[PDB]
């Protein structure tokens, strides 16, 4: 979708805020927000692409200025409601309860060894998105290609600043989970993945830096030939 989150090339967002040092987690709620990703992932709320799409659907004013891990909370709720695993009225009720009683206990629960095993395995083992497909790569290093001007309403990885632009294939990485299906609940449907080089002048016009380029990763349907050798 063409959301505000797609900020590459956007002007006017202001100076970078960069404290001299900062903790990994600024508050306890951030640790909880963070750990909820493997928990909701394991429980089938969403996969990685769907996770991103939930955030992309935030109120943009809220997105632009809220603490980062609040984005994560919004997407858990989004998918919780989407899948019927979270009752929103109960959540609103509990929110007010902990508003009035911030030190009230969490619900009694059993610890689960398998959740710790899941965590360690995901962290050190990873969650690889690479896949084998039956088709060979359509493109190769050196191919001059043009990025699609499609503007899907659903999830995609088509930054507005590269749409319709011409660049050069730099590397074929193999095939990967395709965001345009996966982020919309339509499955992995893997596609070959390429890094494509776009000059700053191509991206930003004839006043652009003549000695700068942006490298952007494109799934196969994103790009079509202009020329080959």
């Amino acid at each position: 979708m063409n959301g505000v989150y797609d900020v590459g090339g956007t002007d006017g967002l202001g100076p970078i805020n960069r404290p001299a040092d900062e903790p990994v987690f600024r508050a306890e709620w951030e640790k909880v927000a963070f750990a909820m990703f493997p928990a909701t992932f394991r429980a089938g709320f969403m996969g990685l692409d769907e996770f991103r799409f939930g955030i992309e659907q935030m109120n943009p004013a809220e997105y632009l200025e809220s603490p980062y891990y609040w984005h994560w909370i919004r997407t858990y709720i989004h998918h919780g409601v989407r899948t019927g695993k979270i009752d929103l009225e109960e959540l609103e009720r509990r929110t007010q309860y902990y508003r009035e009683n911030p030190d009230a206990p969490l619900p009694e629960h059993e610890q689960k060894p398998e959740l710790i095993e899941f965590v360690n395995q995901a962290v050190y083992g990873g969650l690889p998105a690479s896949r084998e497909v039956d088709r060979p790569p359509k493109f190769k290093e050196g191919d001059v290609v043009r990025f699609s001007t499609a503007s899907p309403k659903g999830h995609a990885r088509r930054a507005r600043y590269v749409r319709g632009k011409t660049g050069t294939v730099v590397k074929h990485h193999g095939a990967y989970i395709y965001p345009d299906t996966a982020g919309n609940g339509l499955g992995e449907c893997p596609e070959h993945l390429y890094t494509v080089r776009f000059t700053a002048q191509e991206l930003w016009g004839p006043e652009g830096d003549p000695n700068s380029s942006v490298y952007y990763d494109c799934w196969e349907p994103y790009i079509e030939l202009v020329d080959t050798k």
């Binding site: 967002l13 990873g126 000695n211």
Partner: protein, 204 residues
């Protein structure tokens, strides 16, 4: 930046805290979230996984030309030689700074970052200011925000991680470090140097 519509930071923190505790209570009752799971995730990225791991990779590449070739050929498989890898670094591609090229990495669409070598990203990396501007004016951004002057003749390559490929900058080895040990060289390697927003530390 001033927003006359915005609540105070304290009031925002209070509201978020209640919201998150409520959601937490519900996921706990579903049996899919536990306090030990939360504590483990937090411990891993506070204390086990961080930029000291990337630094070890960098100094090995600095001191081992064959490893460096492997690193630049297949980043994930090379880092595994050091027991480094995993979540959000399943597909790493390392890019080498030289006298002719400077690399800088961004996720314009969100926050993508190579967790297994750098740990979780600092908040400025994830925020709209850096993400919007670095693909558009990298040279000015590096100078204005990071005090880093890249000569206009020197090519700047911005890597936007729109896929699960994770890009990591191999910073140039600082002058004056001939024959330094790996542990001594590691002191020069920063998370910023592997994002590309700064060079590795000068010896001074």
């Amino acid at each position: 930046t001033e927003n006359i519509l915005r609540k105070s930071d304290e009031e925002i923190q209070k509201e978020i805290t209640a919201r998150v505790k409520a959601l937490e209570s519900m996921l706990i009752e579903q049996g899919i979230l536990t306090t030990s799971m939360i504590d483990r995730m937090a411990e891993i990225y506070e204390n086990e996984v961080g930029p000291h791991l990337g630094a070890k990779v960098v100094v090995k590449a600095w001191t081992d030309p064959e490893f460096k070739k492997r690193l630049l050929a297949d980043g994930t498989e090379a880092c595994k030689e050091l027991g480094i890898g995993g979540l959000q670094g399943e597909d790493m591609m390392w890019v080498e700074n030289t006298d002719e090229v400077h690399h800088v990495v961004v996720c314009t669409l969100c926050s993508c970052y190579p967790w297994p070598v750098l740990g979780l990203p600092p908040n400025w990396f994830k925020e709209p200011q850096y993400r919007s501007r670095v693909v558009r004016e990298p040279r000015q951004l590096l100078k204005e925000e990071f005090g880093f002057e890249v000569p206009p003749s020197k090519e700047i390559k911005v890597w936007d991680s729109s896929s699960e490929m994770r890009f990591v900058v191999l910073p140039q080895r600082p002058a004056g470090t001939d024959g330094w040990s790996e542990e001594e060289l590691a002191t020069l390697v920063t998370r910023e140097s592997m994002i590309g927003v700064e060079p590795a530390k000068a010896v001074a």
